[PDB]
Amino acid sequence: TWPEPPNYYEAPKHGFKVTLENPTFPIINPDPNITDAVTNMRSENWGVVAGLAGLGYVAGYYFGAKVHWAKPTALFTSIFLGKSGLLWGMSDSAHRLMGFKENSKEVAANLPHVMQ
Amino acid sequence: MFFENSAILLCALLSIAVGYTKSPFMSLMYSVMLFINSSFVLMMLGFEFLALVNLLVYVGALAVLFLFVIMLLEIPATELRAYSRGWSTLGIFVFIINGVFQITPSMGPRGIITGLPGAESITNLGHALYLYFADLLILNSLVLTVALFGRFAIAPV
Amino acid sequence: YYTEGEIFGTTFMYTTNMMFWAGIVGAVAFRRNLIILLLSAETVMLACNMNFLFTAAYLNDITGAIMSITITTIAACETAIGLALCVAYFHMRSATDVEALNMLK
Amino acid sequence: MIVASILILIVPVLLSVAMFTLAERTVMASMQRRFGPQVSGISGLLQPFWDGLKLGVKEPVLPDSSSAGAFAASPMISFVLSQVAWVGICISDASFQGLVIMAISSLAVYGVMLAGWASNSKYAFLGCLRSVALMVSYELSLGAALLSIGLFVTDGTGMKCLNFAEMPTTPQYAMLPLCLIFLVCILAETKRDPFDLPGYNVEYSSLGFALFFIAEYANMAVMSAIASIYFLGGFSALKITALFFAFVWTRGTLPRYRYDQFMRLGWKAFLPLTLAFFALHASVAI
Amino acid sequence: GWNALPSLVIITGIWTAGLFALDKVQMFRENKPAWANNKDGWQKALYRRDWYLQREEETLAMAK
Amino acid sequence: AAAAAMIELDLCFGLLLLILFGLLSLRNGHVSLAHIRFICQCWLVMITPLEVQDFALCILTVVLLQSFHSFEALLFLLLAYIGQLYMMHSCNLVSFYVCLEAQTLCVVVLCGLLARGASTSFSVEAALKFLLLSAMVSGMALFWFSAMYQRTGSLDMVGQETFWILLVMLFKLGVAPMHMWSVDLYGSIPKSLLLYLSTAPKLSLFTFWASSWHHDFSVGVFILFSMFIGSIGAYGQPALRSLFAYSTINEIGLLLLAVETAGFHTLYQHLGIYIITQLLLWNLTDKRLFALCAVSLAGLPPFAGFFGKAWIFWHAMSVQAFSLLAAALFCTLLSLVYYLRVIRLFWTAPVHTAASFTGAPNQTTLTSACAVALAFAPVMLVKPFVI
Amino acid sequence: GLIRNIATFATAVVGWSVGIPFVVQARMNGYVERNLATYDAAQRQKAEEAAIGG
Amino acid sequence: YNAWSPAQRYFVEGDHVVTAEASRTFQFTGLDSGSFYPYVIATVIATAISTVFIVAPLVIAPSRVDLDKSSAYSVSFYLVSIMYLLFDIEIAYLFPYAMTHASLPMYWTMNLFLAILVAGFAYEWGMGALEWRE
Amino acid sequence: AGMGLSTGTARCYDWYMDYLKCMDERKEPMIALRREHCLEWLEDYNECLHREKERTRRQVIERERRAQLAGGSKPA
Ligand SMILES: CCCCCCCCCCCCCCCCCC(=O)O[C@@H](COC(=O)CCCCCCCCCCCCCCC)COP(=O)(O)OC[C@H](O)CO
Ligand SMILES: COC1=C(OC)C(=O)C(C/C=C(\C)CC/C=C(\C)CC/C=C(\C)CC/C=C(\C)CCC=C(C)C)=C(C)C1=O
């Protein structure tokens, strides 16, 4: 009847895709930023980033050479596949930090005073 | 509430009038009247911003494109069998059955509803558009991109 | 038996139903051009948009307004592409058709 | 009381339009080392009134090859839209008042295009499309400028709006380039110098022509009041006179653009600048 | 020049007098110098409650 | 937290980079864009989730992009793929409407853009008719969605209004008697868009149907209409484009029989075999393989089309849908006659295949020769495979 | 002519503004009557089920 | 419009309220906040004034019949009209953003929206479609 | 999708949530079988939405009021 007095300055904390899970692993950080996601990324993620970049460079060099434009095509294709891999790796690291994936390696490295 | 109900009922008259006339110019004039009147009808429901969007997009932008296309492409052929051929009685029967008698209405079994004015909040709309329906917002952007690229590719050279 | 709000609501719904069927049928029934067919398609979109906004006010719900914005976007994009195609076809076929934009003749 | 308030608004609008068109003649004359109208009444103060009365007893030319209804409707539509926009300036309390006036001014295109369709002139059809293209092209920069303005308009309760009474009463020093773009956009909307190449009222005589010019000058006054509200810290008589003097001053000293030249200006300069300023102001406003 | 001064003075005087008269008329209609302020749903609810309770106070006054 | 949405950000960033790369390549006057096509295929792979149907659509669209050459056509196909992918994940009528409308606009623009020669105006005409017919079906969808939204107060797809939404879905599959837009499209629009139109949207819409749709009604009269009209029309139409349009209506009637009796495993098997045959049909340069398409679209036993028809017949007989099954068997007996007409036209004739002169020598022999090996897939089809 | 067309439009608008509310009123009256019949039938069924249901 | 229910009148009983509402003066600080009703009256009054301007020279002016007095004395517009349509829709989308006190994820979503806009615009710039030579 | 237009949620959102909670807590292997056991909450949600039964009661009172004035016009 009488509505609630609106709070104009407070926006709801909501991401448009909702995970509908509770985490099944210990929670190190419920909300990591990009620095937190990169600084706790595993070596296999960097390996697949470098593999995607190398495959992109080689394939872009092959396809860009038919129109005599091989070097910029190789550089662009390398960056394109590499950023795809980097987004994948950062998401994987953030999910391990939030507790939705296994983080036994991450719990023994991200809590220097809460090690044991 | 005579004038408000009359303004509501005028929209159906203008909807029939768009197709009834033989002049394409007069059809567009009827459509412009209909969209202005509907923008005033939407503001009976409490919507201030969305009625202005209706006006600004449909009358301000799209009807200008309609009038340019009509004025560039229509040499007068209203005598040239637009009057001499008439209309379709089967289509008029379908319109009467479905829109006057309304044998399949949208309310279904219900026949009476209480109209209720709202109170539009643009803070709620901004929160919804940019937090809760953000994927739909981006896909609307992609549709507009399709429109821009596709028009510029289909422009007659 | 019924109140002024009920007259207002039933009048709105009857109006939008007749609007929808007018836009669907009438320009085809009167044997009009493709330009007028696109205008009548805009009448159909307007009827649906008014229904969504009425329901959004009726339920105190946001989904009708989202649908209203989306309907305006899609309808304008489709109409612009259709008018461009109409102009292209008219310039391609006017040398032998004269009444080229009328396929209901 | 609403009818009384509207008529009491309508009286100084028309009186001011007559005095604007006289003041344009006389200021344009003073820049050119002459006098301008002085004979017609003392200090020339009756010249717009005798122009109006001369057009009143002038023969109305109704061409018997046009559609009479649209021909009559075009200057009526222009005049009605100008008066309604003034009412929206002064007799409204709406939340999105600037959006209302932008919507009204987007409707003003119809008088030009109805005049172009109605009259059976070869180059009226040619010039109406050019004038509509100019107005249509600069409306987008006006809208993006309104987007930049509305990022900082908040009332006392905390709600963001475009209500004119909630605008601050100090000049907006942070938006000087956007103010300059707004003023050149006003010049482009009113088809003044340097965008006066497109005319569309070549077949109109007597009071239809008079309605066209009253609508044009009233729209100029509307845009002047809007610019003074948005950038100059309020609506006032002195600000209206100063901005009108500035527009006549620019008309005295500059030549006009070609059609493709102001099209390239509006689609490659003003629109990207207003959008970039909107992005910068949105970054600031967080 | 001196010939351009009277029209420019008259424009200012016309707008000053017209805005003064319009202000007095709308002040007589609304009886408060904040009628043109932005109002949200809470403020609209407050004004409508005030109007109806004023009518009720008038109705109860003509009974004693 | 937005960390669960990196694939969406990757989609948008990839589109932003691809437009700029396509602009830079065109400023050099490159008359071929194989590098742009490879980047488009990489973007297609990078945005697709790890489900069977999603990757089936992804691999199909990667194969389809080899028949398109301009930058704008590649952009339109990518933005149609976004609608095709996200319709399979749509759980409302909001996203359903937007995905369908994006697909319709992309198809209309591509039909306008790619026509050449004397057939340009015919293609533009058929695109205009398709757009007008699509607009009113979209209006019907919006109108009955508004009715459902008012009645239920929510976004659940239940009640009597789902019958009209079902009719919207049947329009999008070219189901008779709402079939004539596809018949108009087949007669004028070029072969690459005909290949695109017969494979990808049917997969997308049937996956939405399998994933998130229930109705309390039947589609049996449209099964009868599609099967009888398609068979008799393909028997009676001498132009080959109309033959294949009507035979497509017959096939969608069989797929609707698979939907109506439940059992979506037979639906998916027949649809996959049909899509591979379509990939062979529209890329043929040697006309002797046109006979293999004929024997594998007639349901003749050792080839894979027999298996795709025969699990549909088996599941229909399992739940005792006798009358629709009898009509399907009669129309199968009729379909053999015009597939034999195809065999008479293109197998019992002298062989002539023109060589290439401006390079690109018989450029899609790999895909056509790979898809002809649908004579070796039947060993895997007989097992419990598609369930 | 212009005066004939303006008069015809004014006549059509006034006739539509007076005639259609009678159509809407008749439709709403029919719905009220059918609803009251449904209420009475439901009350009759409830009395019957109370009579033989204990 | 007048209120038709006791709940719409804040449960005030009597007949004085019904007549007082039906014969009320328009007030932005009474029952008619944010009302847009003066816009309709302004249209009616200005249409009356311009009709009086149209009709009056048919009475008080000379007139002479002559057959010569009643006689006459590109695709870039398609580009402009369609581009203006799309850009006006985009600005209408951006307006609910500017009317909110937006948080940072709203800002980045809006910038993704604007980026898609300006990417299509920059493609049409680079292909020479905003050079109005024809 | 259940967000309010001027409020946080819609006016009948909690009735819908009651119905969906009932549907969640049943164990029948079909939705059509589960719906037969939550019909009271679906009825209360529909009554929140359209108020058909309150309107029916008011119509019945109006029929009796119109009956007690035509058949009964008793003067003092
Ligand atoms: C050349 C391309 C290279 C790309 C790769 C390099 C560039 C870096 C990538 C961009 C940034 C990283 C990705 C997103 C990071 C989100 C993680 C996060 O939490 O960051 C912030 C999250 O904020 C964001 O920036 C959110 C971004 C929202 C993006 C919305 C749109 C998503 C895409 C929708 C597309 C729709 C689908 C289209 C098809 C249907 C806030 O951090 P916090 O929570 O620690 O800080 C708290 C503070 O108070 C603010 O919250
Ligand atoms: C270089 O620029 C210019 C032009 O080119 C663009 C021009 O064309 C004109 C000439 C055109 C004019 C003046 C027409 C426009 C103005 C009009 C009709 C004046 C409007 C005034 C009104 C309505 C008030 C006058 C009426 C009164 C006082 C009522 C009288 C009643 C009684 C006595 C009972 C001028 C001056 C000009 O500078």
CSV table of C-alpha atoms in Angstrom, one decimal, chain A residues 13-110:
chain,number,residue,atom,x,y,z
A,13,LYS,CA,24.9,-6.5,-6.5
A,14,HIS,CA,23.9,-8.9,-9.3
A,15,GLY,CA,25.7,-10.6,-12.1
A,16,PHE,CA,23.5,-11.5,-15.0
A,17,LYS,CA,24.4,-15.2,-15.1
A,18,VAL,CA,23.8,-17.0,-11.8
A,19,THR,CA,25.7,-20.2,-10.9
A,20,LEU,CA,22.9,-21.9,-8.8
A,21,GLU,CA,25.6,-23.9,-6.9
A,22,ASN,CA,27.0,-23.9,-3.5
A,23,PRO,CA,30.8,-24.3,-3.6
A,24,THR,CA,32.0,-27.8,-2.6
A,25,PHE,CA,35.6,-26.8,-1.7
A,26,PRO,CA,37.1,-24.4,0.8
A,27,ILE,CA,36.6,-20.7,-0.1
A,28,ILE,CA,39.7,-18.6,-0.3
A,29,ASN,CA,38.2,-15.6,-1.9
A,30,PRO,CA,34.5,-15.3,-2.7
A,31,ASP,CA,35.1,-12.4,-5.1
A,32,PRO,CA,38.6,-12.2,-6.7
A,33,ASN,CA,39.7,-9.4,-8.9
A,34,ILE,CA,41.8,-9.8,-12.1
A,35,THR,CA,45.1,-9.4,-10.2
A,36,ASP,CA,43.9,-12.2,-7.8
A,37,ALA,CA,42.9,-14.3,-10.8
A,38,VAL,CA,46.2,-14.0,-12.6
A,39,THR,CA,48.5,-14.3,-9.6
A,40,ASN,CA,47.0,-17.7,-8.6
A,41,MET,CA,46.9,-19.2,-12.1
A,42,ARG,CA,48.5,-22.6,-12.8
A,43,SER,CA,51.2,-23.4,-15.3
A,44,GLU,CA,49.0,-25.6,-17.5
A,45,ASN,CA,46.9,-22.5,-18.2
A,46,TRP,CA,49.9,-20.5,-19.3
A,47,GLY,CA,51.0,-23.5,-21.4
A,48,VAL,CA,47.6,-23.7,-23.2
A,49,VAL,CA,47.8,-19.9,-23.7
A,50,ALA,CA,51.2,-20.2,-25.4
A,51,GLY,CA,50.1,-23.2,-27.4
A,52,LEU,CA,47.0,-21.4,-28.7
A,53,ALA,CA,49.2,-18.3,-29.5
A,54,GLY,CA,51.7,-20.5,-31.4
A,55,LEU,CA,49.0,-22.3,-33.4
A,56,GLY,CA,47.4,-19.0,-34.2
A,57,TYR,CA,50.7,-17.5,-35.4
A,58,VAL,CA,51.4,-20.5,-37.7
A,59,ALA,CA,47.8,-20.7,-39.1
A,60,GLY,CA,47.6,-16.9,-39.6
A,61,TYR,CA,50.9,-17.0,-41.4
A,62,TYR,CA,49.5,-19.7,-43.7
A,63,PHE,CA,46.3,-18.0,-44.5
A,64,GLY,CA,47.7,-14.5,-44.8
A,65,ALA,CA,50.3,-15.5,-47.3
A,66,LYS,CA,47.7,-16.1,-50.0
A,67,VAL,CA,47.1,-12.4,-50.2
A,68,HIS,CA,50.7,-11.5,-49.4
A,69,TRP,CA,49.9,-10.2,-45.9
A,70,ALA,CA,51.3,-13.0,-43.8
A,71,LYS,CA,53.0,-11.3,-40.9
A,72,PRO,CA,50.1,-9.0,-39.7
A,73,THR,CA,47.7,-11.9,-40.2
A,74,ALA,CA,49.9,-14.1,-38.0
A,75,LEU,CA,50.2,-11.5,-35.3
A,76,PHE,CA,46.4,-10.8,-35.2
A,77,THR,CA,45.5,-14.5,-35.2
A,78,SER,CA,48.0,-15.2,-32.5
A,79,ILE,CA,46.5,-12.4,-30.3
A,80,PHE,CA,42.9,-13.6,-31.0
A,81,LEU,CA,43.5,-17.2,-29.9
A,82,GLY,CA,45.7,-16.1,-27.1
A,83,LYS,CA,43.1,-13.9,-25.5
A,84,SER,CA,40.6,-16.7,-25.8
A,85,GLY,CA,43.0,-18.9,-23.9
A,86,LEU,CA,43.8,-16.2,-21.3
A,87,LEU,CA,40.1,-15.6,-20.5
A,88,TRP,CA,39.7,-19.4,-20.1
A,89,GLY,CA,42.6,-19.6,-17.7
A,90,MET,CA,41.6,-16.6,-15.6
A,91,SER,CA,38.1,-18.0,-15.3
A,92,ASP,CA,39.5,-21.4,-14.2
A,93,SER,CA,41.7,-19.7,-11.6
A,94,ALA,CA,38.9,-17.6,-10.2
A,95,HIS,CA,36.6,-20.6,-9.9
A,96,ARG,CA,39.3,-22.4,-7.9
A,97,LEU,CA,39.7,-19.4,-5.7
A,98,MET,CA,36.0,-19.1,-5.1
A,99,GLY,CA,35.7,-22.8,-4.2
A,100,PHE,CA,33.8,-24.2,-7.2
A,101,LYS,CA,36.7,-26.4,-8.3
A,102,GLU,CA,39.5,-28.3,-6.5
A,103,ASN,CA,41.9,-25.9,-4.8
A,104,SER,CA,44.3,-27.9,-2.7
A,105,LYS,CA,47.2,-26.3,-4.4
A,106,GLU,CA,45.7,-22.9,-4.0
A,107,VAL,CA,44.8,-23.1,-0.3
A,108,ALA,CA,48.5,-23.9,0.5
A,109,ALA,CA,49.7,-20.9,-1.3
A,110,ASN,CA,47.2,-18.0,-1.0
